[PDB]
Design a protein around this ligand. Sequence first.
Ligand SMILES: CCCCCCCCCCO[C@@H]1O[C@H](CO)[C@@H](O[C@H]2O[C@H](CO)[C@@H](O)[C@H](O)[C@H]2O)[C@H](O)[C@H]1O
Ligand SMILES: CCCCCCCCCCO[C@@H]1O[C@H](CO)[C@@H](O[C@H]2O[C@H](CO)[C@@H](O)[C@H](O)[C@H]2O)[C@H](O)[C@H]1O
Ligand SMILES: CCCCCCCCCCO[C@@H]1O[C@H](CO)[C@@H](O[C@H]2O[C@H](CO)[C@@H](O)[C@H](O)[C@H]2O)[C@H](O)[C@H]1O
Ligand SMILES: Nc1ccn([C@@H]2O[C@H](CO)[C@@H](O)C2(F)F)c(=O)n1
Ligand SMILES: Nc1ccn([C@@H]2O[C@H](CO)[C@@H](O)C2(F)F)c(=O)n1
Ligand SMILES: Nc1ccn([C@@H]2O[C@H](CO)[C@@H](O)C2(F)F)c(=O)n1
Ligand code: NA
Ligand code: NA
Ligand code: NA
Lengths: 403, 403, 403
Amino acid sequence: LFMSCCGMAVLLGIAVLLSSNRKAINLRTVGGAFAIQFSLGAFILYVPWGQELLRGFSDAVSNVINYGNDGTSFLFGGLVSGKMFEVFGGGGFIFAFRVLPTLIFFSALISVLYYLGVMQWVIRILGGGLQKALGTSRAESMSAAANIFVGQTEAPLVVRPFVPKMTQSELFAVMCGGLASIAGGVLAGYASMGVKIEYLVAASFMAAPGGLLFAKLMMPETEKPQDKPANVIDAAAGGASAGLQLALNVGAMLIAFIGLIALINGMLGGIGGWFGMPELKLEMLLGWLFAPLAFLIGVPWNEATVAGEFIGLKTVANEFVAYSQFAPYLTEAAPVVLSEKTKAIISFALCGFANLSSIAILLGGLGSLAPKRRGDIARMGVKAVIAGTLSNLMAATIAGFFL
Amino acid sequence: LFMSCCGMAVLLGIAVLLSSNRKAINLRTVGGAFAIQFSLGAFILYVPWGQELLRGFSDAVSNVINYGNDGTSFLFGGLVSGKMFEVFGGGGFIFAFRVLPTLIFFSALISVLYYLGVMQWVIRILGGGLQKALGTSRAESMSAAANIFVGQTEAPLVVRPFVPKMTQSELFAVMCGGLASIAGGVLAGYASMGVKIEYLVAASFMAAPGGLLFAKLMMPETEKPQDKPANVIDAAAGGASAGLQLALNVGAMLIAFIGLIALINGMLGGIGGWFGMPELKLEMLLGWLFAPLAFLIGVPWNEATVAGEFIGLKTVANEFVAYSQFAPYLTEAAPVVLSEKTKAIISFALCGFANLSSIAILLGGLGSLAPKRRGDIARMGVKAVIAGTLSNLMAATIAGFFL
Amino acid sequence: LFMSCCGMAVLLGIAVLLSSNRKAINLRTVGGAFAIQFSLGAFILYVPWGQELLRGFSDAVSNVINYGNDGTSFLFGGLVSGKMFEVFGGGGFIFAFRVLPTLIFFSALISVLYYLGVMQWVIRILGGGLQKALGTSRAESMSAAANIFVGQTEAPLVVRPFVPKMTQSELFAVMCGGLASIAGGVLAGYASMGVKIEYLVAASFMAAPGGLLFAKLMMPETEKPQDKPANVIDAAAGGASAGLQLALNVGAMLIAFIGLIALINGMLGGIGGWFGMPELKLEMLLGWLFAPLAFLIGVPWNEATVAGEFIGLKTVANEFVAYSQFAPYLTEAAPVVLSEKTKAIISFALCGFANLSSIAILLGGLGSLAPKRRGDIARMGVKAVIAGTLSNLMAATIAGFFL
Ligand SMILES: CCCCCCCCCCO[C@@H]1O[C@H](CO)[C@@H](O[C@H]2O[C@H](CO)[C@@H](O)[C@H](O)[C@H]2O)[C@H](O)[C@H]1O
Ligand SMILES: CCCCCCCCCCO[C@@H]1O[C@H](CO)[C@@H](O[C@H]2O[C@H](CO)[C@@H](O)[C@H](O)[C@H]2O)[C@H](O)[C@H]1O
Ligand SMILES: CCCCCCCCCCO[C@@H]1O[C@H](CO)[C@@H](O[C@H]2O[C@H](CO)[C@@H](O)[C@H](O)[C@H]2O)[C@H](O)[C@H]1O
Ligand SMILES: Nc1ccn([C@@H]2O[C@H](CO)[C@@H](O)C2(F)F)c(=O)n1
Ligand SMILES: Nc1ccn([C@@H]2O[C@H](CO)[C@@H](O)C2(F)F)c(=O)n1
Ligand SMILES: Nc1ccn([C@@H]2O[C@H](CO)[C@@H](O)C2(F)F)c(=O)n1
Ligand code: NA
Ligand code: NA
Ligand code: NA
């Protein structure tokens, strides 16, 4: 457990070194933020009552997923039935029909829960508890709590009239809240790929204090902060349309990226052959390079390289592509049998939208909420991705600690 | 037959009660409009020659559908072949590949028929006959006749330079013409789901006088009314693109709505359990609530509840979702064997875009044709949906009368 | 071989007759342009070393195609596996999952190769060699060389600040470069349909001098010519999104057009029956009408009619629809066994975006680069399509000559 605590120290250390003003770091804020994330981890991953609450929220999500599967079962019929496994076997699981439509249903549901005020009610509680404990501003705290369920570009919408005039520290924290977390739609998508829901739900909740933690470490507050569809069926329709667009984007990206990686590996096998390494692939490079990082967060020495392949791929590309390559390692047909703790660490370290491509996404979604602040987003973009990555790594170290 | 005639009376009665000026109702207009819709029903559903003309137009449509299926058979190959039924059985029918591509072909065809002037030629005849018999204005009569073949947002395009300056009664009638009818694309889609084409074609034609009927009952005229692609291949391309966008929208909606209903039923089973009704579902509620309405339009007492499930679902959601749940009741594997008359009544009462979500659609499509008239559309939106619903119910009562 | 040389003469003759100023035709330009296209044909289709270089570039493309297929194999699983052929046979090949996703991968790859400067490097060499040999301007020469790999609306992007002010001859040549060629995305798509890659690669390269040839014949220069994503992963993402949109457009078009042709044939069988020709179809008309044209470019007398069906369909619709009907003639289950030379001629004569529908496309893509020049594009549109068609026919005659 000493390797984990040192891992937490190193991650905190990098944040301080990369700070904009280490002397401006509020010790109440970053102290409690780490305290909450650690206590939350101790709660739902260690203590009996906390584990019972986590398995109860996950089973509820797992039921919602199955209910939404009635929709895709209607559209694609027997292509998503059980006979697909008899005829095709492992290839019977058609990713395009099994996972992608889940993004559509969950986007429509969340859109409904927003219209009913259910989402706002939960966000107001989680967000209000953070600002009264960390001293963070109202707007950045709501966006942090919102990011537990929705994406990086949808979370600030709950405080969109406060975005164009919020401080650079607030705006940075807003960027970090979305980079450290995921969305409810893709969450259910990853769960359909074999990723344990308990880990996804946990990592999503720990993202709110964790996102604020490294946001106020690398960018402390130095300024002075301040302070709809016609019906429920329209809300569902709008959410379904937004999910469809997302589902198409994710699908095209996976076809391209995986294909590109396959092209890269083919070239790496030829270039590597010139130096006596014809078996050279992208996984080997990412694995060999992220193995120390994986070893630092609590992954065993003999599993650090394989774990480095997935964590590295999540960074250089995105977490969806990483999960796509990590999903086979969660079944009985896995090429490498990993320990249950390592499976948890990778699941937590991948659960985040933290990647270089998300900077252009933050410029698009969050940038449209404050067009005169696009210059500040592009400037703090790199620092925000790093801050988001550290939050995922910390959540993985905490998870590995209590497991 | 006395229950049907009383049904017609009640439907007419509600329209008068909900009128904007019952004293301004032109008895020539609403008298002939009901006369035409009833005579049209008597024509193609009773008399020998009229039935021969209806079965001839439906077989032509059925052939066009099969011709368009050569396109989807090319793209999806064996996934839409006969071997799918051998391997999967009932689940062999893949809705996404069987029904959705039909929207693309029929949208491209109608776009072609517009370029050739074939559509305008038929509309000018049907629309001109209505205005000379009902006294309705030129523009609202053309949009009424256009709505037989095209959707609510495409029909007013034949009279789009007259929309921004037409009276509130004209604009309301335009809204009602599209709410009371469907489109040629989705028509072929419903036909591919097992819905009898003869009913769909009939209901589509009866929508023109029926739409004007309840438009001039709930909103009589109190003011004084007034009065392109480069080639045919481009027209087909533009229509195909519009159909594709529609096909994606419908598909995502069905995945979401059906999934949401599945989620609602799961919750209704838990909430209902608190009051000793664990088998409580959405179908039971909609059925129990729309049973008197179904019984009023001519559905037998022992079939009013089941029929109420579909009619209610068409209202609270849309007719596509309703048809999706009603389609299994048209096959030999139906959970409840319905009478041939009841099957007709449901088919006519569902054949319409009349739902609450269509108000936002009218604001989008029709609203773009008259941006300064969006306030009037949103105001008369609710009344227009009711007026559109009554037209479908009347067409169902007339159909049930002559059957 | 005398029929081929006469074919080249006739094609050149039509260009001179349709010229804007036959007396303004630069004999250095059009002389060398035909010389290069003919020599290029003599190079990679006749001489040993040239054939070895063509088979080497095609095998590289064929490997890239297979690497990209790892992406679609992930998304669609067993629907693109080998068991599909066992269960369905010929219908096992699902076009929607086999060919369409290739457009997505190749669009993402080209987008990456642009970010790395690899594309610009090759274009600068091929484009620079043309302008120093033909005397053509810098901008139109780069767009000509760019068109070898990318589409008609993407090629002028390498010289987009020179488009609004370039002469009518330059703008026309730019239009012709894209009409005479295809794109790298659809190229790999056609290759997946059975079309020989060697022919597609060859025709793509011969399009650059061939496009300029008939551009400076039908529109000689009479005036005086003048003279980015944040990272590589964003470039791949943007290219994947553009490919997805293209893949959806192509798919919807094929469903519609093939379905429309099926509808046309059904009507032609009824109309033709009135004149004692009930077997009358669209293929017969296009075949009987384009048979002299096919016979002129080097197709045997007994194969000119069948070849006329495909060439005609490429013109009246597009090359994708033509390739879709020509692809079965490349397998062992072909209804008509064609000679290897005829298979090459059709492959070269179809390899082009030259169709009437591309005028509206040039108005959209190229028109957005110069909004005040849309009037000139629409004016020279028809002449440009003809000029693009002649370039494909010439490349087919040259190919048939050396084979
Ligand atoms: C298919 C998967 C295979 C794995 C391949 C992994 C390769 C990753 C390459 C990353 O390259 C850098 O990414 C930054 C991302 O933004 C860019 O910064 C750009 O954007 C920054 C953010 O604002 C600015 O600070 C910079 O000035 C600006 O160059 C930068 O140019 C670019 O060199
Ligand atoms: C998945 C299927 C499950 C079945 C569920 C069925 C539930 C239906 C709920 C309908 O709710 C109402 O719908 C109106 C629709 O427009 C809204 O009116 C709104 O729009 C009207 C039209 O302009 C205005 O008159 C109103 O002021 C404005 O509130 C209104 O707010 C809303 O309460
Ligand atoms: C599914 C496949 C079945 C095969 C069917 C084949 C039928 C082909 C019909 C072509 O018709 C012409 O195409 C031109 C294409 O543009 C149009 O020119 C239009 O555009 C030109 C280009 O700018 C202008 O010169 C013209 O004035 C303008 O009429 C023209 O109107 C139109 O009559
Ligand atoms: N709601 C969502 C879901 C996804 N994404 C972007 O898509 C990538 C893969 O999920 C994520 O890495 C991404 F975050 F970049 C997004 O921006 N918003
Ligand atoms: N041409 C069309 C077709 C459909 N729709 C809308 O989609 C719902 C289901 O068909 C219809 O209920 C709807 F009407 F709302 C539309 O607006 N226009
Ligand atoms: N990159 C591309 C690819 C295709 N297209 C258009 O689509 C038709 C079929 O490929 C082509 O005929 C077309 F050219 F018209 C395009 O414009 N640009
Ligand atoms: Na989030
Ligand atoms: Na209509
Ligand atoms: Na090109």
